[PDB]
Design a protein around this ligand. Structure first.
Ligand SMILES: [Mg+2]
Ligand SMILES: [Y+3]
Length: 381
């Protein structure tokens, strides 16, 4: 099996019901100083977006708003691939990046065995090279990339950056200033589809594999197939960035009007803030109470207790709700109200390890449920 990478982390991941406190402690490329409260030394708002001002007052430079001369992507077999997993190498990559006019970025994430989710890999492409950054190994040093990610002079290209922005801050306190989302461009041009696959075919006649879109990216070592899959998400992003700007340029008859909307739309995505998830048992009964609420006092109580048991276990063990106890099972167990512990198991096909490990604790809960008084209209009906 794969050993949880969280165990080798320097700082225990916090997924309590406390609001999210940005991890950034140093603010490169700043215009508005970082609140003293966030300084590494002490460890004017605080839960506010660290680059709120910089982004609000951000606009792309005229250099990028002019007629684009699309630079073809470098042949894949002629492009060097670098694996970065040490501060030294990360620090050197940031230097190269600080001399680029633009570069591409993408993140591989994992959520099945993690409560909040975990960024596992970060891919970056320049006009000449592809980089694969191991963000499990470099989790605590990733903040350094802020120097180039929040450098308004450099354009960061993403394809559909909504999640990446939230992951970048939630995991490494990283933020982005001056971004161009090709996904946003594709929408603004009203293209057939808006996915990266379409853009890769439409612009580079490249076929995209997807065997790994849902793979387990915590795996180490990462097999060549997965590295190839990972570099393909950024290897062609810069060219597409150019070709899409040419299109907006040719549709604007020669005006940077459609270009600026993309930069504007994209900067709004960079202003999105991460917010810890908050689930309630009320919601997990919408599709249920709206079809057949057979749930009596005893059953509803069992569901409440189980819902709570799952939330606490998931947070404590840093696992996703699905790993701990998927809904359909939690709901079935609440329906059957199994008298014996083995009866709870009979409802799990298969049986999730944490449900077997905590079977007695769960049993005592269902037992409480079975002791609840039934209303008159429930004993008879
Ligand atoms: Mg992506
Ligand atoms: Y409730």
């Amino acid at each position: 099996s794969i050993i949880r990478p969280q165990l080798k982390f320097r700082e225990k991941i916090d997924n309590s019901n406390t609001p999210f406190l940005p991890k950034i402690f140093i603010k490169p490329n700043a215009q508005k100083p970082l609140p003293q409260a966030l300084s590494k030394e002490r460890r004017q708002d605080m839960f506010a977006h660290p680059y709120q001002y910089e982004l609000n007052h951000f606009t792309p430079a005229d250099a990028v708003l002019q007629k684009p001369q699309p630079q073809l992507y470098r042949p894949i077999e002629e492009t060097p691939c670098h694996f970065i997993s040490s501060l030294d190498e990360l620090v050197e990559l940031n230097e190269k990046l600080l001399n680029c006019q633009e570069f591409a970025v993408n993140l591989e994430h994992h959520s099945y065995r993690s409560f909040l989710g975990l960024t596992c890999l970060m891919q970056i492409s320049t006009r000449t090279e592809d980089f694969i950054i191991d963000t499990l190994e470099l989790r605590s040093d990733m903040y350094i990339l802020n120097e180039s990610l929040t450098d308004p002079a450099i354009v960061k290209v993403f394809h559909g950056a909504d999640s990446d922005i939230e992951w970048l801050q939630k995991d490494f306190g990283l933020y982005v200033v001056n971004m161009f989302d090709t996904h946003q461009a594709a929408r603004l041009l009203n293209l057939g589809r808006h996915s990266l696959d379409h853009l890769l075919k439409l612009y580079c006649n490249v076929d995209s594999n997807k065997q790994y879109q849902l793979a387990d990216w915590r795996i180490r070592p990462l097999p060549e197939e997965m590295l190839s899959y990972a570099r393909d998400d950024t290897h062609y992003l810069l060219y597409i960035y150019d070709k899409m700007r040419l299109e907006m340029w040719e549709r604007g008859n020669g005006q940077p009007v459609q270009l600026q909307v993309v930069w504007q739309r994209s900067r709004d995505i960079c202003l999105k803030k991460f917010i810890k998830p908050i689930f309630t048992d009320e919601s997990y009964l919408e599709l249920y109470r709206k079809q057949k609420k057979h749930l009596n006092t005893q059953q509803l109580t069992a569901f409440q207790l189980l819902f709570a048991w799952r939330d606490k276990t998931a947070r404590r063990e840093d696992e996703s709700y699905g790993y701990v106890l998927p809904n359909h099972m939690m709901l079935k167990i609440a329906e059957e109200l199994p008298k014996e512990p083995q009866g709870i198991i009979a409802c799990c096909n298969p049986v999730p390890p944490l449900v077997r490990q905590q079977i007695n604790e769960m049993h005592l809960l269902i037992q409480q449920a079975r002791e609840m008084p039934l209303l008159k209209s429930e004993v008879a009906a």
